[PDB]
Enzyme design. Structure first.
Site, mmCIF file in Angstrom:
data_model
loop_
_atom_site.group_PDB
_atom_site.id
_atom_site.type_symbol
_atom_site.label_atom_id
_atom_site.label_comp_id
_atom_site.label_asym_id
_atom_site.label_seq_id
_atom_site.Cartn_x
_atom_site.Cartn_y
_atom_site.Cartn_z
ATOM 1 N N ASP A 91 0.784 -1.219 0.000
ATOM 2 C CA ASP A 91 0.000 0.000 0.000
ATOM 3 C C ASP A 91 0.817 1.271 0.000
ATOM 4 O O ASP A 91 0.309 2.328 -0.350
ATOM 5 C CB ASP A 91 -0.923 0.021 1.204
ATOM 6 C CG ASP A 91 -1.739 -1.248 1.342
ATOM 7 O OD1 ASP A 91 -2.691 -1.241 2.150
ATOM 8 O OD2 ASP A 91 -1.435 -2.254 0.673
ATOM 9 N N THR C 1 -7.574 -2.829 2.129
ATOM 10 C CA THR C 1 -7.831 -1.812 1.094
ATOM 11 C C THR C 1 -6.728 -1.998 0.086
ATOM 12 O O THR C 1 -5.574 -1.752 0.396
ATOM 13 C CB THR C 1 -7.735 -0.381 1.689
ATOM 14 O OG1 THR C 1 -8.522 -0.311 2.888
ATOM 15 C CG2 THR C 1 -8.256 0.679 0.688
ATOM 16 N N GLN C 2 -7.088 -2.423 -1.121
ATOM 17 C CA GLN C 2 -6.116 -2.654 -2.176
ATOM 18 C C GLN C 2 -6.796 -2.870 -3.531
ATOM 19 O O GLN C 2 -8.018 -2.860 -3.628
ATOM 20 C CB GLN C 2 -5.282 -3.871 -1.802
ATOM 21 C CG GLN C 2 -6.110 -5.075 -1.444
ATOM 22 C CD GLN C 2 -5.236 -6.189 -0.996
ATOM 23 O OE1 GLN C 2 -5.104 -6.420 0.194
ATOM 24 N NE2 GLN C 2 -4.586 -6.870 -1.944
ATOM 25 N N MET C 107 -10.535 -5.844 6.681
ATOM 26 C CA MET C 107 -10.444 -4.883 5.584
ATOM 27 C C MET C 107 -9.124 -4.870 4.849
ATOM 28 O O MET C 107 -8.665 -3.817 4.398
ATOM 29 C CB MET C 107 -10.731 -3.479 6.090
ATOM 30 C CG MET C 107 -12.090 -3.330 6.696
ATOM 31 S SD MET C 107 -13.337 -3.757 5.546
ATOM 32 C CE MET C 107 -13.675 -2.148 4.869
#
Ligand SMILES: [Mg+2]
Ligand SMILES: [Mg+2]
Ligand SMILES: [Mg+2]
Ligand SMILES: [Mg+2]
Lengths: 196, 204, 233, 222, 222, 121, 4, 212, 198, 198, 196
Positions: A91, C1-2, C107
């Site tokens: 990320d 989240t990705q 998540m």
């Protein structure tokens, strides 16, 4: 950025251009995108400069420490470290890296870790924005077990094209040769590579 | 914000043996507020019935519109318009505004004076005609109504029986819909006669 | 989240009277660019289970490592490793399932669609699906991504319902699968021609076929087609 | 962006008679427009004569079930194999659910069985814990469709006694188990006709002092 | 919606399911998806129900006229160009995805039209949410030189694929056959494999069940 | 980190550290209280080992826990302060959450419980 | 509108 | 949802509808909107069903604890503040509830408190809460007098809900009545609005515009 | 927002405060006392977001009553307010700031002089002859700027407030159901039960 | 929004409308007459957006007076209203829809019966015994639903409204400065000069 | 979509793949992206199918009407038409087109009109998603004045590659030859182009 690594009879060769941009301005035209993580294991850097430099430094450490404790490290390992860093911190990173090295038992090996954090071993690999333009040439001209002279050419050409088309690339071509006999630093200027 | 849901309302119609029925509730509100309980939603032009759920102003307008159009038709053709036909008029009249529709959901029912076969049909807000030989629904309690109908219905029901059926479907379906109810009317139709009955229902 | 990067498309599978079959091509797409052509997406686990994975590759490679782990850790203080206490598909599945769901609830999902296919100790066939949402299901045929839409329909013509299982043979089954793969090559713009396939039979054990290619393709007709309507030449 | 939820469609229904209770659900599992499985049960037996279904998002569905079944396991342990009463199983689930008040289990859940006085019963839940004991309840995709029907054919709403000038409600008789099944099947066939998510099959779990019985009927697979 | 078209040795055929749907609720259990443009030019459509019908009639009209004015049988490429230029005009807002075919003085024809106004031609095509299912079948069983009967099975099989494996499609199968020298045949409900099993109970309410308040008759004729 | 158990049990069932604290009390000035029919009183003796004090300020032996409750003790003057403060706080923390000042039994049960805790922590 |  | 509670001579009055909705959907007509906290305390529900049901059943517990802890019946002021302070802790998290806490204690007399998820706690005499509050408030204000008889009073509420049920589409179903005196609370039925409207119409003569 | 006013005369401080609690569409209460006695010669009024408002004032009360006890003494206003400012200024960069504005007024038994302090939700403090919060000041200041004088008798002040409230009742969109007034002086705190008309 | 009420008794129709125009932060006028006489036996009251409100009323006045002259006759209410509905329904899909809600009450000298029409900005019309617009209905309807009767004298109505206004003045957030009432009957239209207290 | 046009001795050759996709689905696997606008003037279509089909249809008219009035049109003209459309309606179009034609005076000529609407005349031009991958190969293997047999090859390879790397392309290869001798329709299947 345009980079690729190619495995051959004597060992392996990494090459890259020398352009780092911040948008469309050329920040550094002489950048060295071929970084050492060990006496005989290097990597080509593509993506965010910072992200890459940092990742590399952290691998040189992890390997230097590996060495002291367990001797000379395999390439599969040099890759594993990279993969680990890239995959685990996905990320926050934008770096695509190609690892190339030389072992006495395994000859030459190339692993490529693309944005996702996957690791792939293959006869050769290319990356960098400029690589979109040569999947053709390369898949077409690449033969297994070439000679040093032959490989430097293949690389010299492939990239010159990439530089021709992608504006995110240019400067000079840099190569590094990894073989039993040692490590060689090769460089190629515009006036040569442009007209081929 | 969903025009089709500010005012609330439901309408349903069903076919029987040499008869058809159509009904609706009398509610007219604004969001949560009930305002009128006398908002009939079934209109008739000659021997053809049309009920309209959806935004009240559009219901009103369209009703007025078809009076006009149906009137001229009779003058120009010296004969009262037939269902099968009227439907097509409705469909075209709606699609005419395909890019800024009247937010409603008309339902039509009646009988061919010439052939006698009962007829009913419905449409989405832009004219797709929904032809079904059994039942048609429309309104905020569409889901409910469908539910009621699909279960309660059987073919060839007599005027006295069909009445029970449609009434329940309405009534019951209304009671599970916050925006519908406050009263209900049911029209039973036959070649020669037509009776209009009002139902007793919750007022909450 | 990705957001997945290097990806692998459909995975198809169906079960039959004596075991199961599953297959998936050997490709890793970097978006529209069909980047890697030597990707094995069929992961064997022992001698009685194959797990096929579609979705993000990096994560797949992780689920690989997770499995090799599962294997090692079972042998530990387990004298019955290569026998009565060996890993059963139901175990491997329930684990993965468990993992996938934990990750969606945190998540930070593993962008995948995985079909676990194999046979149990007592002989029962096993086939179940779990995806990035921890959604689990089972049916005589299963598939991910495009295959979902195209393969299932075909495979279901062979095994419409459970009762059709004991009537289908390996040859029949294998033909069907191969076909599905072919069709998928025709329509999935993200597929490749080179694929992989494997069977898990309660007798012959595990047979794994590598370097498969699609054959018997019909393309000749494309010569009678010209222009997009009014063109004559 | 990653959306942590899904919708497997499905639909379930529960009705309680004088001395038995039922809980049924279609056996289809969907995703957008495709069909995942024509047979994936979603009505389970958790021991102690308690049936339960969590209809909505499959994953969240399977979870709750798991957490509950397990709860029951630990109840026995922590309370000398005491039998878990339904009224209690309810309050427990309220807690399970509300536990996740800020990351809800996207499911409408129902469970059924027998109460302490032996009469049959049913409880339904908000996906975040609002619970109440009810005579019958349908939930899920076709809830809007079937619920009304029940209010009619079960709680006899709006029906009246013939000839009484609408001043006398139909007395609240009670349905026979046999008669209850009829309603279920019809409620389903009707549901199947208008709901693209419903179909494939109907599995019914039935509950009485003698245990738990299962019945299965086919549906339209279109 | 699932629609297909398959060309055969001396003609062409098209087919489609019959489910119309507002969201997830079936609106018309047997609506017509085949449209007559001119006696021997039939078109099938998916997308917004209204637009498939409208754009079909509007053109069928403009065509009919055109023919009369030219004392000739219409041509598919005409309907085609007519359809496409119209759709393209509307930047895609007319949700019409059409498969148009037919026979005319020049031979047999098959094309497809997407709502943005692009056309395609081929020996077999399909469109709609059931597109993938059928197309699977087509790619699995097609070959050149299909007879009238082999083709009909083919087109049929393909729709069935959609029905069974696609929630957006269902009910019956419509087929139309256009051969070079014969009249065209419109086979509505060639297949009806989704009939409702007889309901379990009859809800014939005893009369008087409903409470009425006021009762009157209505005046029709003038 | 420091958590050695100082108040433990000995062979005969007494807890030395507690019993000893008692002895500390015995050395502190006396204090007394007796209740009437419509009032209560508290008295205390002043340590005379060192004299030349300033009465105005010196921690008076009797402290107010709230406008309506007082507390006096005999013991290590220092320890008292902690007890008093902890008590004064709960005096407000109770007004604030119950909207009614503490009863004496409560205040007491608080202060005491505080003490008990320190004998097994 | 209807799909339809 | 419409809930009301008010104060006078023979105690406190509490009445509520019994309908819960999921948008336009009538989820249920048989909802218990009054939490029987314990033999002497009552709470009302408005806002989210669960949030209310849960946190009031809970309040019930914290009360039982206080009793065991001090051998004395908990005051309403206190019983309310518990819920209040609780709710304020979660402030901003998305809790939605508006509720009344009603009770009779030797010390305070009959008392009612308004407590909502916003964190407001109010001591008052008459309060209405819910989507249909306005409608009920109407009826009340005009017919309220401290001199009311228990018989009359119970009616005044029943009616006030009724008013609200008619208009507010979000309320209705049936009415659940409650009366509060020191000897605890006393229930006064579950009146189906179905049957009640008509009766009232006829007898009182109002709701004339309705036809029947 | 609600109405909060304060005015310091020669020998006292007067605080006025709307008596209404409105919520969305209805007026819930016509007799709210938006004030707390911090210490027998110090009063604080508040206006703000729903819960924060009371919650905050009650906290300061506790924390002050506690000090008064610990020391058998009463903090001067300049002190009580400063404490209050710090508590507010502490929270503005908190996870959920107290959204409260307060007017604090007290009598300094030691300086034998009255004092009024205004502090907003951010910890902005300032000492003033008269003050207000929210929109109120917008109509009233002019009046005060005009008709105010330091040597005012208390009676003279109540008339001035009346004049104020009158204007507000005349020109303000929302109905605040009147005010509740309180006076702070040497003898403590007393509530004027007559302001519905005087 | 402002307050607009109406109630039809047996021999007439009474209209009540708030007397205040508020703008942002101030109340500009405490004596507005939100109504126009369309014809000698028909009145229309209105509430809505700043300007559209008067503009629309005056336009309707004009278009109706005009008819009154062209034909030496007065249109029935059922017509005047239908006219108004169409004008509204016309505009809803225009470049800038009139954002006005109106109440129309008139006496039908031909049927010798009174009538009240409620029409909202979208042209939603309906005939009613009593009606209101915006939020006002929220408080009043319950009362009317309760205390209403068809055979009510006029005097009975005014008290009913009074009871209504009362509820509003008590429970409504914004101060509308009272109302202006007007009654429409056989002898015309008249304004009740006494409502500040009755 | 991968398309290119190459000029040579005898004339010019147009070539394209045959895949139109909607997202990741293959709508049509046998599409013809080579459209006629005149006896000896054709074009290659890439981008929106709608936008291109339309633009061509409008050209054919424009040229057919041109003919009637003034005889056989030059290519520079066929292009100017496209330009006019593409440039004038830029906000509403997403079509990149390559125009190739044969004249007796000018031999073979190739023009390319990219998303913007500019027109470019060159020895050869490539376009479409799959073109990104061959700027290299092509720039390296194109020689001016090649023979037919040589050109078909150059073209066969370049696209075969593009089809390999780009998934928005595939199917079969289609080529069209424009010379004095006529017009020839060439087609090439997978089983051949894939392994080269
Ligand atoms: Mg360059
Ligand atoms: Mg209601
Ligand atoms: Mg128990
Ligand atoms: Mg169905």
């Amino acid at each position: 950025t345009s980079i690729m690594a190619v495995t051959f009879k004597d060992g392996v060769i990494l090459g890259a251009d020398s352009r780092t941009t911040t948008g469309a301005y050329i920040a550094n035209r002489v950048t060295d995108k071929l970084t050492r993580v060990h006496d005989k294991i290097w990597c080509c850097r593509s993506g965010s400069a910072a992200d890459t430099q940092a990742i590399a430094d952290i691998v040189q450490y992890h390997l230097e420490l590996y060495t002291s404790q367990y001797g000379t490290p395999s390439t599969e390992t040099a890759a594993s470290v990279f993969k680990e860093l890239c995959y685990e911190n996905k990320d926050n990173l934008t770096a695509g890296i190609i690892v190339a090295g030389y072992d006495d038992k395994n000859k030459g090996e190339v692993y490529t870790i693309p944005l996702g954090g996957s690791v792939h071993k293959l006869p050769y690999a290319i990356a960098g924005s400029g690589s979109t333009f040569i999947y053709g040439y390369c898949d077409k001209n690449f033969r297994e077990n070439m000679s040093k002279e032959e490989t430097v050419d293949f690389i010299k050409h492939s990239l010159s094209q990439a530089i021709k088309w992608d504006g995110s690339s240019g400067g000079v071509i840099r190569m590094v040769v990894l073989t039993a006999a040692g490590v060689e630093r090769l460089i190629f200027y515009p006036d040569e590579y442009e007209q081929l | 914000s969903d025009p089709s849901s500010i005012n609330g309302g439901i309408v349903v119609a069903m076919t029987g043996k040499d008869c058809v029925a159509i009904a609706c509730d009398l509610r007219l509100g604004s969001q949560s507020l009930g305002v009128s309980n006398k908002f009939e939603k079934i209109f008739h032009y000659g021997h053809v019935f049309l009920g309209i759920t959806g935004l009240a102003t559009d219901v009103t307008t369209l009703n007025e519109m078809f009076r006009y159009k149906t009137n001229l038709y009779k003058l120009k053709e010296e004969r009262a318009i037939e269902p099968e036909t009227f439907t097509q008029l409705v469909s075209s009249s709606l699609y005419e505004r395909r890019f800024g529709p009247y937010f409603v959901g008309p339902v039509v029912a009646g009988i061919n004076s010439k052939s006698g076969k009962p007829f009913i049909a419905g449409f989405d807000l832009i004219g797709c005609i929904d032809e079904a030989k059994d039942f048609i629904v429309s309104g905020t309690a569409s889901d409910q109504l469908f539910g009621m109908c699909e279960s309660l219905y059987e073919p060839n029901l007599e005027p006295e029986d069909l009445f029970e059926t449609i009434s329940q479907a309405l009534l019951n379906a209304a009671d599970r819909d916050a925006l519908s109810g406050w009263g209900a009317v049911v029209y039973i139709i036959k070649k020669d006669e037509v009776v209009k009955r009002y139902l007793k229902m919750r007022q909450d | 989240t990705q957001q997945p990067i290097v990806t692998g498309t459909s995975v198809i599978s169906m079960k039959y009277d004596n075991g199961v079959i599953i297959a998936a091509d050997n490709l890793g797409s970097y978006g529209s660019l069909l980047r890697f052509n030597g990707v094995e997406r069929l992961i064997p686990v022992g001698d009685n289970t194959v797990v096929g994975i579609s979705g993000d590759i990096s994560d797949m490679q992780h689920i690989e490592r997770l499995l090799k782990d599962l294997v090692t850790e079972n042998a530990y203080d387990n004298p019955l490793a290569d026998a009565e206490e060996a890993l059963e598909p139901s175990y491997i599945f329930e684990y993965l399932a468990t993992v996938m769901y934990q990750r969606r609830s945190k998540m930070n999902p593993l962008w995948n669609a995985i079909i676990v296919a194999g046979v149990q100790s007592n002989g029962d066939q096993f086939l179940r699906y779990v995806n990035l949402l921890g959604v689990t299901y089972s049916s005589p045929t299963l598939a991910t991504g495009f295959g979902a839409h195209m393969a299932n329909p075909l495979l279901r013509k062979v095994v419409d319902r459970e009762s059709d299982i004991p009537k289908t043979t390996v040859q029949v089954a294998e033909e069907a699968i191969v076909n599905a793969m072919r069709v998928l090559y025709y329509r999935d713009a993200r597929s490749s021609r080179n694929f992989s396939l494997a069977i898990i039979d309660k007798n012959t054990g595990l047979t794994f076929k590598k370097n498969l290619q699609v054959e018997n393709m019909k393309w000749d007709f494309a010569k009678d087609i010209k222009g997009y309507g009014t063109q004559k030449i | 962006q990653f959306n942590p939820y899904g919708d497997n469609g499905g639909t379930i229904l529960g009705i309680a008679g004088e001395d038995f209770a039922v809980l049924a659900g279609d056996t289809r599992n969907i995703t957008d427009y495709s069909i995942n499985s024509r047979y994936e049960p979603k009505v389970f037996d958790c021991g102690d004569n308690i049936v339960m279904s969590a209809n909505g998002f499959a994953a969240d569905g399977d979870a709750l079930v798991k957490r509950f079944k397990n709860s029951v396991k630990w109840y026995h342990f922590d309370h000398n194999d005491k039998k878990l009463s339904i009224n209690s199983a309810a309050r427990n689930i309220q807690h399970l659910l509300y536990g996740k008040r800020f990351f809800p289990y996207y499911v409408h859940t129902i469970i059924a069985g027998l109460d302490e006085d032996g009469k049959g019963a049913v409880y339904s839940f908000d996906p975040v814990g609002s619970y109440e004991r009810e005579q019958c309840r349908a939930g899920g995709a076709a809830a809007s469709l079937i619920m009304p029907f029940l209010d009619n054919q079960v709680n006899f709403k709006n029906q009246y006694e013939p000839g009484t000038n609408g001043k006398v409600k139909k007395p609240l008789k009670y349905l026979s188990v046999e008669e209850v099944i009829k309603l279920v099947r019809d409620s389903f066939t009707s549901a199947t006709e208008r709901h693209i998510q419903v179909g494939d099959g109907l599995e019914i779990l039935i509950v009485t002092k003698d245990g738990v019985r299962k019945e299965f009927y086919e549906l339209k697979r279109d | 919606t699932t629609i297909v078209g398959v060309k055969f040795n001396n003609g062409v055929v098209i087919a489609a399911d019959t489910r119309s749907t507002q969201g997830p609720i079936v609106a018309d259990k047997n609506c017509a998806k085949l449209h007559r443009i001119s006696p021997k030019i039939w078109c099938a459509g998916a997308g917004t129900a209204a637009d498939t019908e409208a754009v079909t009639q509007l053109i069928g009209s403009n065509i009919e006229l055109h023919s009369l004015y030219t004392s000739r049988e219409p041509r598919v490429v005409s309907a085609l160009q007519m359809l496409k230029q119209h759709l393209f005009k509307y930047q895609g807002h007319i949700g019409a995805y059409l498969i148009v075919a037919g026979v005319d003085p020049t031979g047999s024809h098959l094309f497809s039209i997407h709502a943005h106004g692009s056309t395609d031609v081929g020996y077999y095509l399909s469109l709609g949410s059931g597109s993938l299912a059928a197309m699977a079948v087509l790619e699995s069983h097609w070959k050149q030189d299909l007879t009238k009967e082999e083709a009909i099975k083919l087109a049929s099989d393909a729709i069935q694929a959609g029905i069974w494996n696609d929630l957006g499609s269902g009910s019956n199968v419509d087929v139309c056959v256009m051969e070079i020298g014969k009249d065209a045949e419109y086979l509505r409900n060639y297949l009806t494999p989704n009939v409702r099993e007889e309901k379990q109970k009859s809800y014939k309410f005893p009369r008087g069940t409903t409470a009425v308040l006021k009762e009157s008759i209505v005046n029709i004729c003038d | 980190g420091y958590d050695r158990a100082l108040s433990i049990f000995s062979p005969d069932g007494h807890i030395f550290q507690v019993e000893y604290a008692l002895e500390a009390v015995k050395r502190g000035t006396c204090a007394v209280g007796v209740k009437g029919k419509n009032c209560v009183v508290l008295g205390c003796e002043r340590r005379s080992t060192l004299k030349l004090q300033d009465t105005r300020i010196t921690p008076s032996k009797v402290s107010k826990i709230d406008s309506h409750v007082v507390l006096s003790f005999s013991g290590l003057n220092a320890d008292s302060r902690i007890l008093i403060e902890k008590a004064r706080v709960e005096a407000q923390s109770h007004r604030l959450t119950l909207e009614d000042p503490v009863t004496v039994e409560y205040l007491t049960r608080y202060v005491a419980g505080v003490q008990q805790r320190y004998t097994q922590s | 509108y209807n799909w339809x | 949802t419409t809930t009301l509670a008010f104060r006078f001579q023979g105690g406190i009055i509490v009445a509520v509808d019994s309908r819960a909705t999921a948008g336009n959907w009538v989820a249920s007509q048989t909802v218990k909107k009054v939490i029987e906290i314990n033999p002497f305390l009552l709470g009302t529900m408005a806002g989210g069903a669960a949030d209310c049901q849960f946190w009031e059943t809970w309040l019930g517990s914290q009360c039982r604890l206080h009793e065991l802890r001090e051998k004395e019946r908990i005051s309403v002021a206190a019983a309310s503040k518990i819920l209040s302070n609780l709710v304020y802790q979660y402030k901003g998290a998305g809790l939605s509830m508006g509720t009344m806490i009603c009770g009779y204690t030797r010390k305070e007399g009959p008392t009612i408190y308004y407590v909502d998820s916003d964190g407001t706690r109010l001591k008052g005499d008459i309060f209405c809460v819910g989507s249909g509050q306005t409608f009920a408030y109407g009826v009340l204000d005009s017919n309220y007098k401290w001199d009311l008889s228990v018989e009359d009073a119970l009616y005044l509420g029943k009616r006030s809900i009724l008013a609200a049920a008619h208009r507010d589409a979000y309320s209705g179903g049936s009415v659940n009545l409650y009366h509060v005196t020191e000897d605890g609370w006393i229930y006064h039925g579950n009146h189906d609005v179905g049957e009640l409207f008509w009766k009232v119409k006829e007898e009182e003569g109002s709701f004339n515009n309705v036809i029947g | 927002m609600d109405i909060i006013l304060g005015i310091r005369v020669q020998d006292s401080v007067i605080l006025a405060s709307s008596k209404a609690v409105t919520r969305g569409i209805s007026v819930l209460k016509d007799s709210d006392d938006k004030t707390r006695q911090l210490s027998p010669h110090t009063l604080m009024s508040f206006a703000g977001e729903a819960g924060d408002t009371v919650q905050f004032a009650e906290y300061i009360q506790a924390n002050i009553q506690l000090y008064s006890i610990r020391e058998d003494y009463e903090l001067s206003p300049q002190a009580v307010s400063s404490f209050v400012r710090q508590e507010l200024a502490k929270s503005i960069r908190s996870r959920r700031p107290y959204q409260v504005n307060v007017l604090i007024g007290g009598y300094d038994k030691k300086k034998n002089k009255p004092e009024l302090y205004q502090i907003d939700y951010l910890g902005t403090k300032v000492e003033l002859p008269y003050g207000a919060h929210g929109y109120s000041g917008f109509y009233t200041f002019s009046l005060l700027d005009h008709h105010y004088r330091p040597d005012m008798t208390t009676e003279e002040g109540l008339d001035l407030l009346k004049l104020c409230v009158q204007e507000l009742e005349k020109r303000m969109p929302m109905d605040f159901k009147g005010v509740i007034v309180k006076i702070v002086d040497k003898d403590g705190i007393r509530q004027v039960d007559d302001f519905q008309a005087q």
